[PDB]
Amino acid sequence: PEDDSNATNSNLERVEYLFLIIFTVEAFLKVIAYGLRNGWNLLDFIIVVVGLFSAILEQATKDVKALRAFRVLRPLRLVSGVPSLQVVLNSIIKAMVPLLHIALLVLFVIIIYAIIGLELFMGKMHKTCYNQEGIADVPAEDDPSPCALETGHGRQCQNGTVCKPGWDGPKHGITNFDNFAFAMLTVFQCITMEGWTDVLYWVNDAVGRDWPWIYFVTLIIIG
Amino acid sequence: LEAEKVQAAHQWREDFASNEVVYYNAKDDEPGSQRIKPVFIEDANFGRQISYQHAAVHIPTDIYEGSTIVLNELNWTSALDEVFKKNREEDPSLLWQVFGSATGLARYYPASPWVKIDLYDVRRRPWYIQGAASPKDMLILVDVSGSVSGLTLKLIRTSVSEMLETLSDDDFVNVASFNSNAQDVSCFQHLVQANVRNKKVLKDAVNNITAKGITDYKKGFSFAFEQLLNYNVSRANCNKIIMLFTDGGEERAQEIFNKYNKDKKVRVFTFSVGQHNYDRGPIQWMACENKGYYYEIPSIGAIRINTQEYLDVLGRPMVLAGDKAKQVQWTNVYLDALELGLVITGTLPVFNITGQFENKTNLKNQLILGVMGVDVSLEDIKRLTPRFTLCPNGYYFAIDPNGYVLLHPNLQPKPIGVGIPTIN
Amino acid sequence: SITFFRLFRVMRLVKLLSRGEGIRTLLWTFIKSFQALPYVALLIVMLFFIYAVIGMQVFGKIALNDTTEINRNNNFQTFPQAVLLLFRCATGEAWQDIMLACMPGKKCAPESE
Amino acid sequence: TIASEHYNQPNWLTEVQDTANKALLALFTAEMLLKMYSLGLQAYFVSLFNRFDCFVVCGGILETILVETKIMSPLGISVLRCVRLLRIFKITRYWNSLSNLVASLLNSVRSIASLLLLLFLFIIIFSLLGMQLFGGKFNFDEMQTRRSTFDNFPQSLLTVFQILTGEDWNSVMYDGIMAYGGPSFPGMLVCIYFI
Amino acid sequence: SLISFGIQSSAINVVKILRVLRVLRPLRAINRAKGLKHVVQCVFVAIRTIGNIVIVTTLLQFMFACIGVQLFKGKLYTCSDSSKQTEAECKGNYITYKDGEVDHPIIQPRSWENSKFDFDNVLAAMMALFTVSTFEGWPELLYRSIDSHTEDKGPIYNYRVEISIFFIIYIIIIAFFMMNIFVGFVIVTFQEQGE
Amino acid sequence: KGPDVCFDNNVLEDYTDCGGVSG
Amino acid sequence: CEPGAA
Ligand SMILES: *[C@@H]1O[C@H](CO)[C@@H](O[C@@H]2O[C@H](CO)[C@@H](O[C@@H]3O[C@H](CO)[C@@H](O[C@@H]4O[C@H](CO)[C@@H](O)[C@H](O)[C@H]4NC(C)=O)[C@H](O)[C@H]3NC(C)=O)[C@H](O)[C@H]2NC(C)=O)[C@H](O)[C@H]1NC(C)=O
Ligand SMILES: *[C@@H]1O[C@H](CO)[C@@H](O[C@@H]2O[C@H](CO)[C@@H](O[C@@H]3O[C@H](CO)[C@@H](O)[C@H](O)[C@H]3NC(C)=O)[C@H](O)[C@H]2NC(C)=O)[C@H](O)[C@H]1NC(C)=O
Ligand SMILES: *[C@@H]1O[C@H](CO)[C@@H](O[C@@H]2O[C@H](CO)[C@@H](O)[C@H](O)[C@H]2NC(C)=O)[C@H](O)[C@H]1NC(C)=O
Ligand SMILES: CC(C)CCC[C@@H](C)[C@H]1CC[C@H]2[C@@H]3CC=C4C[C@@H](O)CC[C@]4(C)[C@H]3CC[C@]12C
Ligand SMILES: CC(C)CCC[C@@H](C)[C@H]1CC[C@H]2[C@@H]3CC=C4C[C@@H](O)CC[C@]4(C)[C@H]3CC[C@]12C
Ligand SMILES: *[C@@H]1O[C@H](CO)[C@@H](O)[C@H](O)[C@H]1NC(C)=O
Ligand SMILES: *[C@@H]1O[C@H](CO)[C@@H](O)[C@H](O)[C@H]1NC(C)=O
Ligand SMILES: [Ca+2]
Ligand SMILES: [Ca+2]
């Protein structure tokens, strides 16, 4: 964290220069002897170019270290390096093109349910019990849950608490139906059957316990 | 003299059920230990209800009574009650007499019930610390490199703010920090007197440090050894110690230690703070070569205990002195925990001298059993200096060898302020 | 004041979804095969009904503390609630926590004596 | 005697079971020796259970000493004799079916070990990418230290495996989102990684 | 039902163990709704066919549980105060700080507690491993077992991170290999049965 | 004026009791 | 003195 390092991370950067110089002479010897059409060779060239650019930029400044993520695509050269695994990779990848007629259905279901959640639960999960001294800090454990006003049909606040707006959200504002970006991701998370009951119960505490199940159970069954 | 003798004759026994311990717990309204119900007659001098028949015991809330350590301490500290009453009978004006034990429990006479959450600990009191060791020259080193960012930084900030609370006006302290370049955290640049005002500056400056950069132990320790070799400013000319607040690393800095203290005249105490997976090997090595100790602080709850155990190491030369180290010391004017006003307290350490007549123990006999304590209220001193014979403009006053007034007409039973109060 | 009329507009996208010779054929054939076996799907309904009734008679009286896994949202106090709990366990959502919240030594509930 | 080891067991049970773990081991070694020399020393390697029994017996004898004199802490090496209870299926018709499955599994070993190699390469690549993105960033001031992080290589491998199994992947995704700011256009864009 | 209305006097006993057998009321339509009788006969014929995959998996789970009892028995115990690593050292109360605020202490009791699912017996390990195979709460067990080092002792942060290979192997073999074998066996069995 | 007594650097001290020399 | 604010 925060620009720290040690001796090992200092020597590894030096070794990266040797690795890059080796790959660059490989690129030279294959580019002045063939003149790229294959995907694997093009990927190798892309990795070499990005490595050269990153090394030069880091020597210049001395987001700097943010394009080093292209180094993780170098293990992908082991698949290309042996012809006995390219066949397996192709047999795995070519089994996927029949599944593109299910990916489209999943996408349409996600979009439709995101729009329905936008029209049903938009902005309803932004209030919680706040004690009665003002808005101090969400006085309900480390897990505050949405409530509803006295005129609402959601969860009512406890004895010494009052429902008051101005709250980030159930998961720091990440899980909600505010836009087509939050909703389209909450719907996907529910579709993967992970943490869908949490969203269902947050909605239950928000609007009520009568008709969010018709949404969530149908989404689970269909998608 | 009646606590060293009784402790030596004590036999360490591990079964307390068949043979219960009878005592009065101060903070109360259990097999293995019986409790007493006192009469608690109201009496003068003190401003509460007291019982002159037995001594009360205070045990910290995080110290479990019923342990083999606490219960063993409650027997040999029962012949103290007979010496507590003899002192009171000879001098009827005697105020609180107390034995602060190294275990954590304080036995005081006369018995009186203890005063929200009780955070009292006898091992952190100013009168206990001043008798447990000689004045020091603490210099705190704080690792503010990148790896300490996050939870382990707020644990370091709290830990430094808690060891500054163990320093009196006779000790000298400064706080530094290294993040591949060692610097001070405050406007001081050298050791300061560590009084109420100076410690507030260090506490405020420590709370404002940010973690970013490369760890470098050689530059940090060179700065620390340079600041302990000033001799241009007022100092204590006593225990020269260094606290290193880091998490872990791979650097031993053996070149620096061979350059600055080859004779090992400066102790090094090393602390490993937070939960991490960094190497704690070099951190423990600096604490063994240099005549110090190694402590670990993994959470907030371990801050209080681990920041006050460095006085057991500092008391080792004091025990080996023998009878030459048994001098009564009087603390500054402070407010009594059991509310009585402004008081000063006498102090005398107690040594573990089991096997002394055999001359071969030297194992736990290098540590102290605890610190004695007798309180003298400022009203008692004011009665020895009659005033009504002089004019209304005439008065007495007395001062410490520090400038602090022991008695003065303008000395009020209120704490001194060190800035503008604020609320968040 | 109603919202169920607004949901009609989104259904127009279903018309676009039901296009192409792959999506339409796959969905239609799978729906037809689902319809051709209405009794295989009845076994799951029977299992859910039986287990919901058993859960109602056994764990139906457990107190609803909100710090446990038997709450207002999750309980055995009604047939729809028991069915929803069994659906949650079928989807694999902390089912072991509900199991451990139904162990002996928990509090009963106001009404259940 | 292997499935009777509990926590805080009676002191006589830990004696009966360790004497059994030696007497039965010697008796199984005698079983091996009787079968080998009386049936040909190369006909004892033709079968598959025979080689498995050879390996398990040899491993039991070897690993008994390492726990006998403290060099190594027990790992349950003999529990694999049970894999011989599957011999009771010979009395049933459901043993020619279970032998051909093992035959096919051992015949397609070169394909299984390549599919598993690709599965491991995928995990390694995504572990390195997650280490690059979220390495040294899950350090929030909250009093809880996150366990599923991207700070080491083994920790990154465990986190990527946990995401692959699906359990609590949304929590790691939320930690990654909050590590790059919070809910915002440039910051929340690091969720395509977890998706 | 008749003997339920027959006693009518011991209505504190039997009733709560006789009203549970009332759930067999819907099961009387199996022999009245032909087709429902056929799709119950089909399931009972299919259940006897997977009697190899269900027994081999049970044996593998038993073996893995027996190996896990030798690694994590008496080792998954924790004290509420993280600084205490013994039952005789975890008595009394300790100071807890709410939300890591040093200025707001709270006194809580000190309790020596086990994991939610332990490896103390051979019947608790098979229940701790079933929940891992269902991919529910398995990271909690993983990071609780990583911290275990010694019997009758508390946890140590990242003691044996190399013990996660046990859970990884169990997940790959049981939760990924054998479950997919069961699904594929159902697929192939149905193919042959109906084709 | 500081105290005139100072107790440190005693040769007979143990020095073998750290917190990490054992564990 | 009366407390301030922050
Ligand atoms: C003043 O100094 C004297 C000696 O200088 C000191 O008396 C000594 O007390 C200790 C106990 O702390 C005795 O230790 C005996 O031997 C071992 C060592 O601890 C104990 O056995 C176990 O030890 C582990 C620690 O590793 C401990 O956790 C465990 O609870 C112990 N018991 C078990 C496992 O059953 C013995 O129990 C312990 N007691 C015996 C044998 O009775 C020393 O023997 C004592 N030395 C002498 C000369 O008596 C005394 O405590 C000091 N004063 C104070 C206030 O601390
Ligand atoms: C911590 O342990 C014990 C808890 O009370 C105390 O040991 C017991 O003290 C009793 C009180 O003196 C003894 O009874 C008398 O002892 C004296 C001295 O030997 C004699 O008069 C008799 O032995 C006895 N009187 C009788 C029997 O009428 C117990 O004998 C004694 N038991 C043991 C096992 O030591 C310790 O004294 C206590 N520590 C302190 C400092 O008090
Ligand atoms: C005070 O501290 C300084 C440096 O820490 C000591 O070193 C002297 O510094 C001054 C000014 O730089 C100069 O006199 C010399 O460069 C240094 N040596 C001497 C002998 O003065 C200094 O000795 C300390 N003491 C005093 C009285 O200045
Ligand atoms: C042959 C295989 C399949 C079955 C083996 C069954 C035997 C060996 C196992 C299964 C259940 C086990 C018991 C499960 C629970 C307890 C309670 C506790 O006091 C520890 C021991 C004890 C009593 C175990 C002893 C061993 C045990 C009886
Ligand atoms: C190939 C898949 C698995 C990963 C895709 C990664 C790329 C497309 C995404 C994912 C994470 C993203 C980053 C997330 C957050 C920030 C911080 C801020 O400064 C804006 C840009 C930046 C730095 C984003 C740039 C684009 C980014 C790097
Ligand atoms: C205490 O001091 C006073 C003042 O000198 C006097 O009573 C006496 O010396 C002491 N009292 C005793 C010893 O009882
Ligand atoms: C949950 O149940 C009730 C509800 O208040 C109460 O006993 C407590 O909060 C919880 N139970 C226990 C045993 O802590
Ligand atoms: Ca560092
Ligand atoms: Ca889950």
Task: Identify which of D6, D12, D85, D88 to mutate to test ligand 4's pocket (most ligand atoms within 8 A of the CB).
Answer: D6
Task: Point out the ligand 6 atom lying closest to the alpha carbon of residue B92.
Answer: 14
CA dihedral B50, B56, B60, B66 (to 10 degrees): -150
As a whole number of angstroms, the distance between CA E47 and CA B234 comes to 90
Q: How many CB pairs under 8 A join D and E?
A: 77
Strand partners, B178: B143, B182
What is the DSSP-derived secondary structure letter of residue B25?
Answer: E
A105 CB-side CA count, 13 A: 18
- Minimal Cβ distance to D86: which of E59, E137, E162: E59
Rounded to the nearest whole angstrom, what is the distance from the C-alpha of residue D132 to the centroid of ligand 5? 11
> Does residue D44's CB lie within 6 angstroms of at least one atom of ligand 5?
no
* Omega within 30 of 0 (cis) for the link into B392: no
Distances (CA, A) of D162 to A122, C86, D150, D155, E180: 32, 25, 12, 10, 19
Task: Please list the alpha-helical segments (H only) found in B164-295.
Answer: 196-206, 217-227, 254-260, 281-289
Identify all chain D residues contacting A106, using CB atoms and an 8 Å cutoff. Answer: none
* Chain D interface test: which of E77, E99, E135, E160 (most D C-beta within 10 Å): E135
Interchain CB distance below 8 Å, G4 and B420: yes
C65 CA to middle of ligand 7, Å?
6
User: Is the Cβ pair C42, E39 closer than 8 Å?
Assistant: yes
Task: Give the span between the Cα atoms of B171 and B240, in whole angstroms.
Answer: 10
Tell me what percent of chain B is helix, strand and coil, each rounded to the nearest 5. Answer: 30, 20, 50
Ligand nearest to the CA of D176: 5
Query: Which token pair is A62?
Result: 């001395």
| Gyration radius of chain A over CA positions | 27
Q: Is the Cβ atom of D36 under 6 angstroms away from ligand 5?
A: no
Task: Tell me the helices (H) and strands (E) count for chain E, helix number first.
Answer: 8, 4
Query: Closest-lying ligand to the alpha carbon of B190?
Result: 3
Nearest-CA residue for ligand 7 atom 6 is C65
**Which chain D residues contact residue E171 at CB under 8 A?**
161, 165
Query: How far apart, in whole angstroms, are the C-alpha atoms of residue E137 and residue E130?
Result: 11
Say what angle helices D153-165 and E138-146 make with each other, to 10 degrees: 160
Q: What angle do CA B358, B362, B366 make, to 5 degrees?
A: 125
Distance B173 CA to ligand 3 centre (A): 22
D128 lines ligand 5 (CB under 6 A): no
Number of continuous H segments (helices) and E segments (strands) in chain D: 7, 0
CA atoms within 13 A on the CB side of E159: 15
To the nearest 5 percent, what fractions of chain C are helix, strand and coil? 55, 0, 45
With a 6 A CB cut-off, is D85 part of the ligand 4 pocket? no
Residues 168-207 of A with CB under 8 A from C: 193, 195-197, 200-201, 204
CA-nearest residue to F1 within chain B is B401
Do residues B256 and B225 make contact, with C-beta atoms less than 8 angstroms apart? yes
Three-state DSSP at B268 gives strand
Please report where in the chains the tokens 């170019």 appear, as a residue. A49
Question: Cα(B82) to centroid of ligand 6, in Å?
Answer: 21
B375, β-bridge pairs: B345
Distance from the first to the final alpha carbon of chain A: 40
Given the structure tokens 């109602």, which residue do they identify? C56
- Give the integer Cα–Cα distance in Å for D179 and D173: 10
**Tokens read off for B332:** 């500054």
Rounded distance from Cα B406 to ligand 5 centre (Å) = 67
Query: What is the sign of the dihedral through the CA atoms of B152, B153, B158 and B159?
Result: positive
Q: What resolution in angstrom units was achieved for this structure?
A: 2.9
Return the residue of D nearest to A82 by Cα: D114
Interface of C with A in 7-36 (CB under 8 A): 7, 10-11, 13-14, 17, 22-23, 26-27
Q: How far apart are CA E153 and CA E78, in angstroms?
A: 8
A102 contacts chain C (CB < 8 A): yes
In degrees, rounded to 5, the angle at the alpha carbon of residue D46 between the alpha carbons of residues D44 and D51 is 65
d(CA B325, CA B302): 31
Query: Chains with 3 or more CB pairs closer than 8 angstroms to G?
Result: B
Give dist(CA F8, CA B274) in Å, integer: 31
Mutation target to probe the B interface, by most B beta carbons within 10 A, among F1, F4, F16, F17 is F17
First to last CA, chain G: 16
Q: Is the CB of B76 under 6 A from ligand 2?
A: yes
* Cβ pair C96:E40 closer than 8 A: no
Ligand 5 atom 4, closest CA? D193
Whether the CB-CB separation of E40 and E75 falls below 8 Å is answered with no
Distance between CA atoms of residues E93 and E80, nearest Å = 9
Contacts of C53 (CB under 8 A, 6+ apart): C79, C82, E22, E23
Separation of first and last alpha carbons in chain B: 51
Q: What span, in angstroms and rounded, lies between the C-alpha atoms of B176 and B178?
A: 7
Specify the residue with its C-alpha closest to ligand 7, atom 7: C107
Quote the crossing angle between the two packed helices E53-72 and E122-133, to the nearest 10°. 110
CB B64 within 8 A of CB B70: yes
In sequence order, the 6+-apart residues with CB closer than 8 A to the CB of A119 are: C3, C6, C7, C10
Write phi, then psi, for C73 (nearest 5 degrees): -75, -40
Q: For the residues of A104-167, what is the DSSP string, one character each?
A: HHHHHHHHHHHHHHHHHSTT-S-EEE--SSSS-S--SSS---B---TTSSSPPP-TT--EEE--
Read off the tokens for E3: 């003997």
Q: Which atom of ligand 6 is nearest to the CA of B384?
A: 4
Residue identified by tokens 């709704």 is E33
CA-to-CA distance for E138 and D161, rounded, in angstroms? 11
Q: Which technique?
A: cryo-EM
Give the chains touching D; criterion: ≥3 Cβ pairs < 8 Å: A, B, E
Distance, in angstroms, between C73 CA and closest chain A CA?
6
Give the ligand whose atoms come closest to the C-alpha of residue B86.
6
- What tokens were used for C15? 């018309």
* E65-99: burial string, b at 16+ Cβ within 10 Å, e else: bbbbbbbbbbbbbbbebbbbbeeebbbbebbebee
Q: Which two tokens stand for residue B335?
A: 């407010």
> Which residues touch C37 (CB under 8 Å, ≥6 apart)?
E39
Q: What's the CA gap between B283 and B271, in Å, rounded?
A: 8
Which one of the ligands is nearest to C105 CA? 7
Cα distance between residue E177 and residue E175, in whole Å: 6
Give the span between the Cα atoms of F10 and B316, in whole angstroms. Answer: 8
Other beta carbons less than 10 A from residue A46's beta carbon? 12
Burial label, C96 (beta-carbon count in 10 A; 0-12, 13-18, 19+): buried
Judge whether E136 and C94 are in contact, CB under 8 Å.
yes
The answer for residues whose C-beta is within 8 angstroms of residue D63's C-beta and 6 or more apart is: D72, D75, D77
Residue of A nearest to B212 (CA): A2
B77 lines ligand 2 (CB under 6 A): no
Contacts of E23 in chain C (CB under 8 A): 50, 53-54, 57
Q: Is D63 assigned to a binding site? A: no
Rounded CA separation A74/A83 (Å): 17
Question: Percent helix, strand, coil in chain F (nearest 5)?
Answer: 0, 0, 100
- Helical pair D153-165 and D169-179, crossing angle rounded to 10 deg: 130
- Are the C-beta atoms of residues A44 and A20 closer than 8 Å to each other? no
Helices (H), B228-377: 254-260, 281-289, 303-306, 310-314, 316-321
**In this structure, are strands B21-25 and B33-35 parallel, antiparallel, or unpaired?**
parallel
Q: Which residues of F touch B265 (CB under 8 A)?
A: 9
In this structure, what token pair is assigned to residue E113? 């507690």
H or E segment at E93? strand E93-97
Ligand 8 mean position to A102 CA, how many Å? 49
Taking the centre of ligand 3 as the mean of its atom positions, its distance from the CA of residue B78, in whole angstroms, is: 58
CA proximity to E83, closest of B304, D8, B72 = B304
Cβ contact B212–A2 (<8 Å):
yes
Q: Which residues contact G1 (CB under 8 A, 6 or more apart)?
A: B420, B421
Q: Chains contacting A with at least 3 CB pairs below 8 Å?
A: B, C, D
**What share of residues in chain G are helix, strand, coil (percent, to 5)?**
0, 0, 100
C-alpha span between D86 and E51 (Å, rounded): 13
Query: Cα E157 to the chain's mean position, in Å?
Result: 25
CA–centroid distance for D65 within its chain: 23
Amino acid in position B353: I
Backbone φ and ψ for E125, nearest 5 degrees, come out as -65, -40
E117 touches chain C (CB under 8 A): yes
Cβ contacts of A96 within 8 Å, gap of 6 or more: none
Q: How many residues does chain E have?
A: 195
The C-alpha atoms of residue A181 and residue A20 are separated, in whole angstroms, by 40
